[PDB]
């Protein structure tokens, strides 16, 4: 199938995700609405259920609302059965409308519909090329007071009808009982209750196994992408393991939510995105967008920097999901913020790198500062807004022009209020000029692009005051960029040499199937490369110009670079493909008597890639924790590592470049062939 097809569950770079709070869109079925004080017909009260369900989405899918808007994927709230109880938080009754307070991940939220309904939604969506992405928060259950069982549903977790256990009298240790996260450390956040949310203990095998089984179900059903919530509050090791489990079943595009409140880098966030096997929601791109266009707190340079700084940190910057607003913040539009700016931030998002998402209601210029005001009911389904217009023109570009989909970004012109940047992938190009100034226009002179000689038209038709240019070998001729103007000029052509635009997913073990997207691969099956290893014949499950489905060859676990060769002509390399050793399990390492100096730390490293193949580098595990689950001088760390394999490992303290290893013999362990396990040792 072409890389653009809805069939491509491994890549959403060519897509436009429409993020929707199911309950707040369209109540297609009233029969499934909550009874009593959990329900609000007018939806005037947002802490309540308004009625929204899957039929309603089915509906807007059939009358082409989404197809006229050009969004190629729907991101809906978590489908799993939530707590039925109502919770008043000091005078105010709250409901699980958001879908965050789960109790059973193997049943569907009846207020959203049935299993048939869901399967009925998955069908209608693919029928029209709309992918379905869902939320899945494996971090916790519902709010739970341990002293008090009469509060909510005491976080009780079921398993397709059968109850596993609640927060109180949790003899087996499913949840964590460390109190709440005061948010001072990464550890404090991971291992402790988020607010009052019942924290799971993924080290517990039944919980480990449960989630593997649960996601497997939803994937088996048709989901194309999964959005993991609260990833900053669950161990990386456990998630990376959860991931390898998913990629072994039906590899789908997964991303997570690690909150950042600025365009500024955060190692932890970078690291995560890079070592977890999943991507993130580009909160730095979002901030950049907003200071510039919404808040007027930064200028175009700040935007250009964020563009570059992010490309350096993230390994696959194209997988980071972008946005202008979302359920975690004030609606972009406000009385002080004007439309052209909203439309400008859209145009920017829609044409920039990564996977873009649009919070439902944006096209309608919905406003609503804070929670749940940023979760207001869907106000209209008109296709007349200027916002609506801009999306329909700019979104299909992601499917038609691969410079948008997989291309690099480089600035041709810039100044405080003006920005002209260029996307390019192979021979294809796209140029976007932006002028945020609402009162003055700009005389752009000397602009150079890589647009072949021609007379170039504004893809937007001047809706956003775009003009027409003329290129003379890159050389664009002196032109005015009107006030609040924005124009998009592109250039597509056929690719002749193979050129990789994507590899999906980018981590797995030998035996898995990965998707290579690009252009020019040709039709006659060629050969793939994982480093120096040539994959050929029946290993290449599929082959065609824009996509190749290949099998991860049985090579040595490590970081590799994928190269493809269509007619002897090798393409470029998609660096950083992580090849595992095989199936993963999660092992909690505990070392005692590890006394560090001020500013010193402990890392893990062993004889397998998962542990860094004896390195003290970035590839080593750590720094280890020492506060919640175990305290200093006892350190601990959960790590994803090959199952049923004899491991050798040794701890080491680093404090400068100066490393200090454990003495004596390497510690050994034979990992479980499945699930999770603990392994305690003493600092030698």
Given the rule CB under 5 A, which residues bind Ca ion? 27, 29, 32-33, 51, 53, 139, 199, 233
Q: How far apart are CA 311 and CA 314, in angstroms?
A: 6
- Work out how close the CB of 277 gets to Ca ion at its nearest, in angstroms, rounded to a whole number: 19
Q: Which residues pair with 89 in a beta bridge?
A: 92
Dihedral sign, Cα of residue 281, residue 285, residue 288, residue 294: negative
Tokens 């039944």 locate to 206
Which CB sits closer to Ca ion, 137 or 431? 137
- Work out how close the CB of 625 gets to Ca ion at its nearest, in angstroms, rounded to a whole number: 13
Which CB sits closer to Ca ion, 32 or 276? 32
- Output the CA angle 114-5-18, nearest 5 degrees: 55
* Secondary structure of residue 244 in the 3-state scheme: helix
- Work out how close the CB of 136 gets to Ca ion at its nearest, in angstroms, rounded to a whole number: 14
- Work out how close the CB of 49 gets to Ca ion at its nearest, in angstroms, rounded to a whole number: 8
Preceding omega of 372 cis (within 30 degrees of 0): yes
Q: How far apart are CA 615 and CA 310, in angstroms?
A: 26
Residue 543: closest CA among 580, 511, 513: 513
Which CB sits closer to Ca ion, 4 or 29? 29
Which CB sits closer to Ca ion, 27 or 458? 27
Contacts of 340 (CB under 8 A, 6+ apart): 438, 464, 484
- Work out how close the CB of 27 gets to Ca ion at its nearest, in angstroms, rounded to a whole number: 5
Which CB sits closer to Ca ion, 86 or 265? 86
- Work out how close the CB of 541 gets to Ca ion at its nearest, in angstroms, rounded to a whole number: 37
Which CB sits closer to Ca ion, 59 or 139? 139
- Work out how close the CB of 304 gets to Ca ion at its nearest, in angstroms, rounded to a whole number: 37
H or E element in which residue 558 lies: strand 558-566
Residue 444: closest CA among 460, 433, 455: 433
Which CB sits closer to Ca ion, 33 or 367? 33
Burial status of residue 88 (CB atoms within 10 A of its CB: 0-12, 13-18, 19 or more): exposed
| b/e 416-443 (16+ beta carbons within 10 angstroms → b) | ebbbbbbbbbbbbbbbbbbbbbeeeebe
Q: Which residues pair with 75 in a beta bridge?
A: 19, 133
Chain centre to alpha carbon of residue 75: 11
- Work out how close the CB of 285 gets to Ca ion at its nearest, in angstroms, rounded to a whole number: 26
- Work out how close the CB of 139 gets to Ca ion at its nearest, in angstroms, rounded to a whole number: 5
Which CB sits closer to Ca ion, 29 or 352? 29
- The number of beta carbons lying within 10 Å of the beta carbon of residue 497 is 16
CA-derived radius of gyration, the chain: 26
Q: How far apart are CA 638 and CA 632, in angstroms?
A: 16
Which CB sits closer to Ca ion, 35 or 597? 35
Preceding omega of 505 cis (within 30 degrees of 0): yes
Which CB sits closer to Ca ion, 187 or 363? 187
- The number of beta carbons lying within 10 Å of the beta carbon of residue 204 is 18
- Work out how close the CB of 638 gets to Ca ion at its nearest, in angstroms, rounded to a whole number: 11
- Work out how close the CB of 508 gets to Ca ion at its nearest, in angstroms, rounded to a whole number: 25
Which CB sits closer to Ca ion, 233 or 250? 233
Q: How far apart are CA 280 and CA 229, in angstroms?
A: 10
Q: How far apart are CA 33 and CA 45, in angstroms?
A: 15
Q: How far apart are CA 395 and CA 351, in angstroms?
A: 8
């Amino acid at each position: 199938d072409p890389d653009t097809a809805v069939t491509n569950k491994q890549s959403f770079s060519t897509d436009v995700i429409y993020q929707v709070f199911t309950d707040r869109f369209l109540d297609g079925n009233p029969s499934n609405n909550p009874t009593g004080a959990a329900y609000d017909a007018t939806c005037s009260n947002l802490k309540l259920y308004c009625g929204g369900d899957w039929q309603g989405l089915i509906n807007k899918i059939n009358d082409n609302y989404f197809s006229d808007l050009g969004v190629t994927a729907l991101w809906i709230s978590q489908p799993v059965e939530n707590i039925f109880a109502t919770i008043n938080y000091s005078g105010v009754t709250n409901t699980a409308y958001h879908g965050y307070w789960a109790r059973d991940f193997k049943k569907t939220n009846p207020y959203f519909g049935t299993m048939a309904d869901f399967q009925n939604l998955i069908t209608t969506a693919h029928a029209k090329g709309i992918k379905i992405v869902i939320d899945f928060a494996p971090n916790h259950t519902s709010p739970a007071m341990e002293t008090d069982t009469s509060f909510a549903e005491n976080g009780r977790l079921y398993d397709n009808g059968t109850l596993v256990g609640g927060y109180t009298n949790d003899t087996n240790g499913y949840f964590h009982h460390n109190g709440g996260s005061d948010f001072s450390s990464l550890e404090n956040g991971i291992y402790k209750n988020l607010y009052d949310l019942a924290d799971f203990n993924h080290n517990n095998a039944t919980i480990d196994k449960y989630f593997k089984d649960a996601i497997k179900l939803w994937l088996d059903m048709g989901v194309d992408g999964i959005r993991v919530a609260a990833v900053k509050h669950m161990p990386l090791g456990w998630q990376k393991s959860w991931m390898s489990s998913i990629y072994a079943h039906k590899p789908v595009f997964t991303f997570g939510e690690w909150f950042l409140g600025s365009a500024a880098s955060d190692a932890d966030n970078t690291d995560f995105a890079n070592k977890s096997g999943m991507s993130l929601l580009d909160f730095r791109f979002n901030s950049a967008v907003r200071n510039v266009f919404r808040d007027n707190t930064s200028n175009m340079y700040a935007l250009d920097s964020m563009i570059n700084s992010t490309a350096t940190d993230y390994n696959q910057v194209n997988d980071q999901v972008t946005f202008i607003d979302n359920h975690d913040m004030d609606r972009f539009k406000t009385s002080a913020v004007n439309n052209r700016r909203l439309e400008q931030a859209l145009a920017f998002t829609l044409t920039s790198r990564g996977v873009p998402a649009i919070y439902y209601g944006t096209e309608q210029y919905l406003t609503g500062n804070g929670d749940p005001d940023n979760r207001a009911k869907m106000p209209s389904f008109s296709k007349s807004t200027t916002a609506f217009n801009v999306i329909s023109k700019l979104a299909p570009l992601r499917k038609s022009n691969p410079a948008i989909a997989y291309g690099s970004t480089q600035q041709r012109w810039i100044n405080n209020d003006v920005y002209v940047y260029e996307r390019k992938f192979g021979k294809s190009v796209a140029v976007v000029a932006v002028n945020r100034n609402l009162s003055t226009s700009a005389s752009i002179t000397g602009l150079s692009t890589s647009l072949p000689t021609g007379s170039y038209t504004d893809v937007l038709g001047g809706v956003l005051n775009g003009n027409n240019i003329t290129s003379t070998n890159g050389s664009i001729n002196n032109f005015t960029l009107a006030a609040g103007a924005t124009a998009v000029w592109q250039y597509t052509t056929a690719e002749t040499t193979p050129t990789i635009g994507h590899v999906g997913p980018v981590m797995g073990k030998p035996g898995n199937v990965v998707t290579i997207d690009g252009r020019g691969f040709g039709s006659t099956k060629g050969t793939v490369y994982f480093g120096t290893t040539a994959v050929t014949g029946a290993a290449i499950t599929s082959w065609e110009d824009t996509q190749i489905k290949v099998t991860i060859p049985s090579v040595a676990a490590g970081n590799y670079a994928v190269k493809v060769a269509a007619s002897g002509v090798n393409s470029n390399a998609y660096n950083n493909f992580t090849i595992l050793t095989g199936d993963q399990v999660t092992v909690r390492f505990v070392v005692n008597n590890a006394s560090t100096t001020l500013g010193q730390n402990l890392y893990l490293t062993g004889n397998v890639a998962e542990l860094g193949n004896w390195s003290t580098g970035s590839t080593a595990i750590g720094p280890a924790f020492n506060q919640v689950i175990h305290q200093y001088p006892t350190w601990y760390y959960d790590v994803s590592v090959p199952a049923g394999k004899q491991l050798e490992f040794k701890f080491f303290k680093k404090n400068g470049s100066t490393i200090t290893w454990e003495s004596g013999s390497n510690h050994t362990f034979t990992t479980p062939a499945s699930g999770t396990a603990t392994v305690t040792v003493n600092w030698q």
